[PDB]
């Protein structure tokens with residue numbers, strides 16, 4: 001029998017750890033879930049269903065229900081694109097678009113771009129963890145409280161917009177090298193902004209955010225460590241690649257993407273590899289010395305890609321190579337992608353060129369729009 005899951009979402013407070021992901025993996029591999037006699041008594045199984053994008057839970061005795069029955073494949077988007085509010089628009093206006101590029105890669109690799117700037121608040125993939133993280137807080141943290149994090153630009157914007165829609169104040173901290181939209185847009189949205197001209201990176205700022213959290217008592221939402229980041233991308237981003245691959249009739253052989261917190265590419269890899277362990281994850285390694293906004297190298301410390309049972313292959317990509325790929329996608333597709341998006345296309349093109357990849361459909365996650373990076377675009381033109 002089916003029950004609406006939204007009545008059981010307190011498992012999102014109480015379940016801790018990654019062991020519930022074993023249930024997620026098995027449900028996704030088999031395409032079905034067993035009925036719970038007493039759903040309340042199995043909170044890891046319930047959380048596993050939520051995280052894979054179920055909206056209904058299987059209830060009763062000895063029965064089972066398919067992904068489809070459980071709502072993994074429900075259509076959420078109103079056909080006419082009318083929404084009663086911004087947050088409802090965020091939530092129901094999904095999937096983000098999956099668009100086949102006209103670029104051809106060697107060796108039968110066909111490229112589809114998932115365009116994460118189709119998110120209403122930060123015009124980036126960061127809307128998703130910001131909504132999941134603030135929503136998780138909202139039953140436990142008093143309205144009017146301050147929330148804060150370190151950000152490279154996007155999450156700070158997403159966080160400021162969402163905190164404010166939920167009745168919180170926000171503070172964002174940025175390194176000096178962050179884009180200007182990141183330093184300015186959060187103030188437009190009512191947040192306080194602290195810029196550290198000395199910080200050589202975003203994670204460099206975390207000790208300072210933690211120390212101020214202890215003194216001032218704000219909630220440090222820590223997108224680098226908060227499992228709600230990875231979980232947002234499981235029930236959103238990753239579920240979408242899966243359902244979009246099926247309904248689109250793609251022959252999905254892999255996904256490609258970049259790594260900041262590692263939240264969205266861990267979810268994409270974990271979720272798809274649960275369905276078919278041979279699906280590749282091709283991930284960008286910014287070349288040493290280079291700065292590609294929003295992303296960084298794996299050995300600088302990333303939670304989910306490291307702790308989860310995920311296969312992937314790395315590819316080094318210089319800033320200059322990322323920007324060359326921005327230029328090529330622009331002139332092929334009329335789509336203006338961000339540097340991190342250019343880096344991921346480049347990473348996939350490299351793996352294609354080396355003969356490493358099967359022919360088929362590959363999905364590249366494009367974190368944001370290139371309109372936000374005019375002076376990198378200028379440098380790339382020369």
Ligand SMILES: *Cc1c(COP(=O)(O)O)cnc(C)c1O
Pocket residue numbers: 124125126152153154155258259260261262263264265293294295338340341367368
């Ligand atoms: C956050 C971000 C990324 C990387 O997503 P992570 O999920 O946090 O692994 C890539 N590019 C840009 C522009 C981003 O803001």
